[PDB]
Amino acid sequence: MELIRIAMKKDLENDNSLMNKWATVAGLKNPNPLYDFLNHDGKTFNEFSSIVNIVKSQYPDREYELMKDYCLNLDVKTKAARSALEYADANMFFEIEDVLIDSMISCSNMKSKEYGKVYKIHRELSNSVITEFEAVKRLGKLNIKTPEMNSFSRLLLLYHYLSTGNFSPMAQLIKQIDLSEISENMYIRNTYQTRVHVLMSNIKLNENSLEECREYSKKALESTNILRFQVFSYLTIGNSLLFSNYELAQENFLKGLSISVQNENYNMIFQQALCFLNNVWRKENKWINFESDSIMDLQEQAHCFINFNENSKAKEVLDKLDLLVHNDNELAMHYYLKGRLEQNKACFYSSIEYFKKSNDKFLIRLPLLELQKMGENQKLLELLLL
Amino acid sequence: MELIRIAMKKDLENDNSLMNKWATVAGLKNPNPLYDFLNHDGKTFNEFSSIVNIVKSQYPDREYELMKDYCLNLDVKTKAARSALEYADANMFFEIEDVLIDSMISCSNMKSKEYGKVYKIHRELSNSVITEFEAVKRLGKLNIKTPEMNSFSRLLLLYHYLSTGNFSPMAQLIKQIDLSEISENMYIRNTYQTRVHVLMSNIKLNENSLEECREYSKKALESTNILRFQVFSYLTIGNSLLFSNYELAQENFLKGLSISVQNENYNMIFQQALCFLNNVWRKENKWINFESDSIMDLQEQAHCFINFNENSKAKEVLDKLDLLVHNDNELAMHYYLKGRLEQNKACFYSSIEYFKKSNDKFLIRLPLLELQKMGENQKLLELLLL
């Protein structure tokens, strides 16, 4: 018997009216399938939402431990296990996901085998085990039959383009996703619906359509109860505000921090966001990571030192950075910083140039702002955001 | 029984040494399969290049009439008919292509059925019978098995993006094509190789990598004997030169006109190219179409009138145009022209704005040049090109 059923029975003896509270929370028409779930091994709810919502409602603090246990006892050939694969991925529960994938790739059920292989491609692409060219090649060769995996094959690519800064294929790819084709699995349909709204929000951020960006993140938030999509919606909203409204940006980053502080990753993500925000607005910065030697944290150190005319301190950090291999995006920042330190238009021009190479219509504001202050034509600077 | 075999036998009796002349031209090791082709109904060459090259060599002036007849008597289930479908499409022989497609969709051979359906999607997308979203949907649903149709499904989309001005997804899509996977049909492999070189040349034009552009068009020309790919290679080379070298641009357009003047479409394409060139360099313009009411020709009329300070005449043409529904690209031109007529910086800014909306890194030079002349910062104007 799974930890979730043990905990639900122990809590059912102390409080007998939890039966109809859980049946409503699970979205069921009567307590019937919930009864089945408690007294017969392997009886799974028609929709995976049912158990998720119960766990979130009743054991919010224990979600990972309980869901891990439940998921890893699931018959890998059922609809519930397929739902579990999505649930693990959505939540970034990698150890659950990888076990599920591994049994699914070589099982007798054809539908489970397909989800298995598609999610494997996603995992491999995320970790740089394979190139994008090999991923798409392998996806073609699967002859994908379910509309679920048909959507996920696009989403998986969308994630990869987003994290490598390769924005241009995104707008066209997302328009091809059609979730209305997914009819058997409502958990997957809705989770994917959330995935799409956050992805849309991000695309809009990159094209500098800031209101639309926020409109899409709000749709994301209203569509989900998964921490991960909430984290990234708050992050995107905050970013969409980074240059225009300090207070509202800060509020969004702190909101995100507050729901996610428990998790080291999410914590760091909001720490970095707050750090950026505070350097952009030239405030005192309690969020600088003095212990990291990554390029991002060092640039923030520099940016801060420069903001406060701590010029010698800036130079040391800039010296440390000139020894590190920069990509196009990181070089754009480098030139921005150099430009600020030496008050040199040429550096801002190079900054613009590299932001343009890396297709960044966001951070490019930094060198554009400096040029404005130096009296360059505001009309031209605005067109450079286009 | 086909007109091509009748004409080849009649020409073989009057001149007996045509046997080894045609065998070399067909690329065969000896006259053997050529003998078979002439004296047994339905014997088709191993590679479709063989009959094409013969026809081009021997009946250049009658290629369409003869190839039409030959193609439409072909067993729709053979490799030669599949080759014929490519040959008709490459050449824009639409009446041959549509008949071939239509019999191929519902024949017993699996491979022919697949090429049939893919090319149908291409035809329908080219004519706006279906949307891009429906094309890709329908292609997924075909479960494409051959590497030939796997390449064509990308090429077909590439064509659509190119003709609708939707450049951003192109770079990523073309990188996914791998023609080295096509082993069974050398005609299709090589024709596609030409398709890819021209498409590459065009992508490079749009990204303003002008040397590479030309390098790709030259590869195109050296790889083909199809008029269509020659036309578009000369057009692209000329366009890559439109702003930098008048003489060499003109030479390329005139070369293209000379090999293609017989065909109404190609004629008009070079007429428009020459027209643009000559307005850009502010010469007398032999190529203005005073009889057309399309937006493109009217803008060229205006551009010319403006070049020669015929300001009232310009204004009438501009008035006529404001009554027609404009695209983003057409509006960009409109503002450019308006800008030149009233020497008004605001119009050039709007021009830049709409070129930016339509992802045009080419014609955008026009309003940029005016701003230079009006003394705006050259560094900033350069960055506006990317």
Short mmCIF file of C-alpha atoms in Angstrom, two decimals, chain B residues 65-371:
data_model
loop_
_atom_site.label_atom_id
_atom_site.label_comp_id
_atom_site.label_asym_id
_atom_site.label_seq_id
_atom_site.Cartn_x
_atom_site.Cartn_y
_atom_site.Cartn_z
CA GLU B 65 5.28 19.84 -75.72
CA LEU B 66 7.36 16.67 -75.80
CA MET B 67 7.93 16.28 -72.05
CA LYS B 68 4.25 16.96 -71.38
CA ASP B 69 3.30 14.13 -73.71
CA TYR B 70 5.94 11.76 -72.30
CA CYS B 71 5.16 12.50 -68.65
CA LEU B 72 1.41 12.08 -69.03
CA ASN B 73 1.80 8.59 -70.61
CA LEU B 74 4.02 7.38 -67.77
CA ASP B 75 2.91 4.57 -65.45
CA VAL B 76 2.11 6.61 -62.33
CA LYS B 77 3.61 3.82 -60.11
CA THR B 78 7.15 3.96 -61.49
CA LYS B 79 10.31 5.80 -60.39
CA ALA B 80 10.18 7.72 -63.68
CA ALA B 81 6.74 9.15 -62.88
CA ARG B 82 7.93 10.17 -59.39
CA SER B 83 10.88 11.83 -61.11
CA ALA B 84 8.40 13.46 -63.54
CA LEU B 85 6.48 15.01 -60.65
CA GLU B 86 9.66 16.73 -59.45
CA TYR B 87 10.53 17.73 -63.03
CA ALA B 88 7.09 19.34 -63.56
CA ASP B 89 7.26 21.21 -60.25
CA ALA B 90 10.84 22.38 -60.66
CA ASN B 91 9.87 23.75 -64.09
CA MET B 92 6.55 25.25 -62.97
CA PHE B 93 4.74 23.08 -65.53
CA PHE B 94 1.52 23.20 -63.52
CA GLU B 95 -0.76 21.34 -65.90
CA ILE B 96 1.67 18.36 -65.98
CA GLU B 97 2.17 18.49 -62.24
CA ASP B 98 -1.57 18.61 -61.29
CA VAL B 99 -2.49 15.66 -63.53
CA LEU B 100 0.43 13.61 -62.13
CA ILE B 101 -0.54 14.52 -58.52
CA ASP B 102 -4.17 13.65 -59.11
CA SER B 103 -3.51 10.10 -60.42
CA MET B 104 -0.79 9.53 -57.82
CA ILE B 105 -2.99 10.32 -54.77
CA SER B 106 -5.15 7.25 -55.40
CA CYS B 107 -2.85 4.66 -56.95
CA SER B 108 -1.80 1.27 -55.49
CA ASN B 109 1.93 2.12 -55.07
CA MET B 110 2.82 3.38 -51.56
CA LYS B 111 5.80 5.57 -52.51
CA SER B 112 3.96 7.29 -55.42
CA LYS B 113 0.94 7.93 -53.14
CA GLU B 114 3.19 9.74 -50.62
CA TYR B 115 4.95 12.00 -53.19
CA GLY B 116 1.48 12.68 -54.59
CA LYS B 117 0.04 13.90 -51.34
CA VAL B 118 3.08 15.97 -50.29
CA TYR B 119 3.18 17.79 -53.65
CA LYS B 120 -0.61 18.34 -53.39
CA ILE B 121 -0.08 20.08 -50.04
CA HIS B 122 2.61 22.19 -51.72
CA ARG B 123 0.29 23.13 -54.57
CA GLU B 124 -2.55 24.02 -52.25
CA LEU B 125 -0.36 26.09 -49.94
CA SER B 126 1.13 28.00 -52.99
CA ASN B 127 -2.34 28.99 -54.12
CA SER B 128 -3.69 29.89 -50.63
CA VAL B 129 -6.24 27.03 -50.84
CA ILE B 130 -5.08 26.02 -47.28
CA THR B 131 -3.34 27.93 -44.46
CA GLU B 132 0.21 27.17 -43.28
CA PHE B 133 -1.19 25.68 -40.05
CA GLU B 134 -3.31 23.20 -42.12
CA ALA B 135 -0.42 22.23 -44.40
CA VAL B 136 1.90 21.25 -41.51
CA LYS B 137 -1.02 19.44 -39.82
CA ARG B 138 -1.76 17.45 -42.97
CA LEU B 139 1.95 16.62 -43.43
CA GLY B 140 2.26 15.23 -39.88
CA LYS B 141 -0.82 13.06 -40.55
CA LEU B 142 0.87 11.47 -43.62
CA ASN B 143 3.50 9.73 -41.48
CA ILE B 144 6.18 10.50 -44.12
CA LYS B 145 8.34 7.43 -44.81
CA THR B 146 10.73 8.35 -47.72
CA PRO B 147 13.75 10.69 -47.23
CA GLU B 148 12.73 12.39 -50.53
CA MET B 149 9.32 13.58 -49.13
CA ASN B 150 11.01 14.28 -45.83
CA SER B 151 13.15 16.91 -47.57
CA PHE B 152 10.26 18.18 -49.75
CA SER B 153 7.94 18.80 -46.78
CA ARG B 154 10.57 21.30 -45.51
CA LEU B 155 11.24 22.81 -48.96
CA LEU B 156 7.49 23.36 -49.51
CA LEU B 157 7.30 25.35 -46.26
CA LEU B 158 10.50 27.21 -47.07
CA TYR B 159 8.85 28.38 -50.35
CA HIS B 160 5.79 29.58 -48.48
CA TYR B 161 7.79 31.50 -45.84
CA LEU B 162 9.84 33.07 -48.66
CA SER B 163 6.90 34.29 -50.69
CA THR B 164 4.98 35.69 -47.65
CA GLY B 165 8.03 37.64 -46.34
CA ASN B 166 8.13 35.44 -43.24
CA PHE B 167 11.96 35.09 -43.05
CA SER B 168 12.65 34.25 -39.35
CA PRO B 169 11.81 30.48 -39.32
CA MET B 170 13.86 29.89 -42.56
CA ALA B 171 17.41 29.61 -41.18
CA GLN B 172 16.41 26.89 -38.73
CA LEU B 173 14.25 24.93 -41.19
CA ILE B 174 16.82 24.73 -44.03
CA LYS B 175 19.50 23.38 -41.59
CA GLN B 176 17.26 20.36 -40.94
CA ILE B 177 17.26 19.25 -44.63
CA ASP B 178 19.76 16.47 -45.32
CA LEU B 179 19.93 15.50 -48.94
CA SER B 180 22.66 12.93 -48.39
CA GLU B 181 19.84 10.67 -47.08
CA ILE B 182 18.36 10.53 -50.63
CA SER B 183 20.01 7.55 -52.36
CA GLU B 184 17.49 5.86 -54.71
CA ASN B 185 16.58 8.80 -57.06
CA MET B 186 19.54 10.85 -58.31
CA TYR B 187 17.31 13.18 -60.35
CA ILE B 188 15.38 14.13 -57.25
CA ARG B 189 18.56 14.40 -55.19
CA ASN B 190 20.18 16.78 -57.65
CA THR B 191 17.12 18.85 -58.37
CA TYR B 192 16.62 19.30 -54.61
CA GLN B 193 20.32 20.20 -54.35
CA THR B 194 19.68 23.03 -56.76
CA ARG B 195 16.47 24.01 -54.81
CA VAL B 196 18.58 24.22 -51.60
CA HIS B 197 21.35 26.32 -53.14
CA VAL B 198 18.79 28.90 -54.39
CA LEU B 199 16.96 28.94 -51.10
CA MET B 200 20.30 29.31 -49.21
CA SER B 201 21.26 32.19 -51.51
CA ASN B 202 18.00 33.93 -50.69
CA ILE B 203 18.28 33.40 -46.93
CA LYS B 204 21.78 34.83 -47.06
CA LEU B 205 20.46 37.86 -49.02
CA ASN B 206 17.94 38.55 -46.30
CA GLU B 207 20.64 38.32 -43.58
CA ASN B 208 22.79 40.65 -45.63
CA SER B 209 25.65 38.14 -46.08
CA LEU B 210 26.08 39.26 -49.72
CA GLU B 211 29.24 37.35 -50.71
CA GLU B 212 27.81 34.11 -49.38
CA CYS B 213 24.55 34.90 -51.22
CA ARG B 214 26.40 35.09 -54.51
CA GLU B 215 28.50 32.05 -53.73
CA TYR B 216 25.26 30.04 -53.27
CA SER B 217 23.63 31.30 -56.44
CA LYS B 218 26.75 30.39 -58.39
CA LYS B 219 26.61 26.85 -56.95
CA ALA B 220 22.94 26.82 -58.02
CA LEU B 221 23.82 27.78 -61.62
CA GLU B 222 26.67 25.23 -61.89
CA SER B 223 24.32 22.48 -60.61
CA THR B 224 21.43 22.93 -63.01
CA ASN B 225 20.11 23.10 -66.53
CA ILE B 226 16.51 24.04 -65.47
CA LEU B 227 15.45 27.53 -66.69
CA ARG B 228 13.54 28.31 -63.49
CA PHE B 229 16.57 27.87 -61.18
CA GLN B 230 18.70 29.88 -63.58
CA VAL B 231 16.14 32.72 -63.61
CA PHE B 232 16.03 32.89 -59.83
CA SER B 233 19.82 32.58 -59.46
CA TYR B 234 20.38 35.55 -61.77
CA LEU B 235 17.63 37.46 -59.96
CA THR B 236 19.19 36.81 -56.52
CA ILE B 237 22.72 37.66 -57.70
CA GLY B 238 21.42 40.91 -59.16
CA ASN B 239 19.53 41.73 -56.01
CA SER B 240 22.60 41.03 -53.90
CA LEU B 241 24.26 43.80 -55.93
CA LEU B 242 21.35 46.26 -56.10
CA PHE B 243 22.89 48.71 -53.63
CA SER B 244 26.58 48.23 -54.26
CA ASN B 245 27.37 47.77 -57.97
CA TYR B 246 24.99 49.07 -60.63
CA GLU B 247 26.83 47.67 -63.61
CA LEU B 248 27.10 44.15 -62.30
CA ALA B 249 23.49 44.13 -61.09
CA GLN B 250 22.22 45.30 -64.42
CA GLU B 251 24.34 42.66 -66.16
CA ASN B 252 22.84 39.90 -64.08
CA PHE B 253 19.25 41.06 -64.64
CA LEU B 254 19.79 41.45 -68.41
CA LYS B 255 21.41 38.01 -68.59
CA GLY B 256 18.33 36.60 -66.83
CA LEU B 257 15.97 38.49 -69.14
CA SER B 258 17.76 37.17 -72.19
CA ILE B 259 17.42 33.51 -71.28
CA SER B 260 13.82 33.94 -70.19
CA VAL B 261 12.04 36.67 -72.17
CA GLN B 262 9.75 34.02 -73.90
CA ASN B 263 7.90 33.37 -70.61
CA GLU B 264 5.49 36.14 -69.43
CA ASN B 265 6.24 35.63 -65.75
CA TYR B 266 9.99 35.58 -65.96
CA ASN B 267 9.84 38.56 -68.30
CA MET B 268 7.90 40.55 -65.73
CA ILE B 269 10.18 39.49 -62.90
CA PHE B 270 13.23 40.90 -64.69
CA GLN B 271 11.31 43.97 -65.77
CA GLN B 272 10.54 44.72 -62.14
CA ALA B 273 14.11 43.98 -61.03
CA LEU B 274 15.54 46.32 -63.67
CA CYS B 275 12.95 48.88 -62.75
CA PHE B 276 13.92 48.78 -59.11
CA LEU B 277 17.60 48.93 -59.90
CA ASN B 278 17.22 51.96 -62.06
CA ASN B 279 15.10 53.86 -59.55
CA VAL B 280 17.53 53.03 -56.74
CA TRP B 281 20.43 54.50 -58.73
CA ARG B 282 18.27 57.42 -59.94
CA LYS B 283 18.89 56.74 -63.71
CA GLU B 284 16.42 57.16 -66.56
CA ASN B 285 14.15 54.23 -66.29
CA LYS B 286 13.20 52.26 -69.36
CA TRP B 287 11.33 49.71 -67.28
CA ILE B 288 8.45 51.47 -65.60
CA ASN B 289 5.18 49.81 -66.26
CA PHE B 290 2.75 52.78 -66.89
CA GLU B 291 -0.16 50.39 -67.62
CA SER B 292 -0.39 48.41 -64.37
CA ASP B 293 -2.51 49.18 -61.28
CA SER B 294 -0.66 46.95 -58.83
CA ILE B 295 0.97 48.56 -55.81
CA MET B 296 4.55 47.65 -56.82
CA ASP B 297 4.40 49.31 -60.26
CA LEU B 298 2.70 52.45 -58.94
CA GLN B 299 5.41 52.85 -56.25
CA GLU B 300 8.09 52.57 -58.97
CA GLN B 301 6.27 55.24 -60.96
CA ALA B 302 6.28 57.48 -57.92
CA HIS B 303 9.91 56.73 -57.10
CA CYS B 304 10.91 57.73 -60.64
CA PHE B 305 8.77 60.89 -60.75
CA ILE B 306 10.33 61.90 -57.40
CA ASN B 307 13.85 61.19 -58.73
CA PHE B 308 13.25 63.70 -61.51
CA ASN B 309 11.41 66.39 -59.47
CA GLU B 310 8.12 65.74 -61.15
CA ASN B 311 6.44 66.49 -57.79
CA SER B 312 2.84 66.98 -58.94
CA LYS B 313 2.97 63.76 -60.93
CA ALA B 314 4.37 61.94 -57.87
CA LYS B 315 1.60 63.26 -55.64
CA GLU B 316 -1.14 61.99 -58.03
CA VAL B 317 0.37 58.50 -57.97
CA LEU B 318 0.73 58.64 -54.20
CA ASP B 319 -2.98 59.76 -53.92
CA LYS B 320 -4.09 56.82 -56.10
CA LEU B 321 -2.06 54.49 -53.78
CA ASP B 322 -3.50 55.73 -50.46
CA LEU B 323 -6.85 54.32 -51.68
CA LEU B 324 -5.41 50.76 -51.87
CA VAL B 325 -5.04 48.29 -49.00
CA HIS B 326 -1.38 48.11 -47.97
CA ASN B 327 0.75 45.42 -46.37
CA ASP B 328 3.46 46.26 -43.84
CA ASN B 329 6.14 46.01 -46.58
CA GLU B 330 4.06 48.19 -48.97
CA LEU B 331 3.51 50.77 -46.25
CA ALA B 332 7.27 50.92 -45.58
CA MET B 333 7.77 51.88 -49.24
CA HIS B 334 4.87 54.27 -49.08
CA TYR B 335 6.47 56.17 -46.19
CA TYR B 336 9.84 56.15 -47.90
CA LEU B 337 8.27 57.77 -50.97
CA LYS B 338 6.25 60.21 -48.86
CA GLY B 339 9.50 61.04 -47.03
CA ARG B 340 11.30 61.85 -50.21
CA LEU B 341 8.47 63.98 -51.62
CA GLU B 342 8.10 66.26 -48.54
CA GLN B 343 11.65 65.94 -47.18
CA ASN B 344 10.19 64.94 -43.79
CA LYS B 345 12.30 62.90 -41.27
CA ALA B 346 9.13 61.58 -39.57
CA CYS B 347 8.19 59.70 -42.75
CA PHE B 348 11.59 57.98 -42.88
CA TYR B 349 11.18 56.91 -39.24
CA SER B 350 7.80 55.36 -40.08
CA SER B 351 9.38 53.75 -43.10
CA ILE B 352 12.02 52.16 -40.84
CA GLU B 353 9.31 51.05 -38.47
CA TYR B 354 7.34 49.18 -41.13
CA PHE B 355 10.41 47.63 -42.71
CA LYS B 356 11.15 46.35 -39.23
CA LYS B 357 7.61 44.89 -38.80
CA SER B 358 7.99 43.04 -42.15
CA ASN B 359 11.48 41.78 -41.23
CA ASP B 360 13.07 43.50 -44.29
CA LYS B 361 16.85 44.01 -43.90
CA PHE B 362 17.13 44.92 -47.61
CA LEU B 363 14.94 47.78 -48.88
CA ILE B 364 15.36 49.41 -45.44
CA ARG B 365 18.52 50.92 -46.93
CA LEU B 366 16.37 53.46 -48.78
CA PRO B 367 15.14 55.46 -45.76
CA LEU B 368 18.49 54.86 -43.98
CA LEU B 369 20.33 56.52 -46.89
CA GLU B 370 18.07 59.60 -46.72
CA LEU B 371 18.70 59.93 -42.97
#
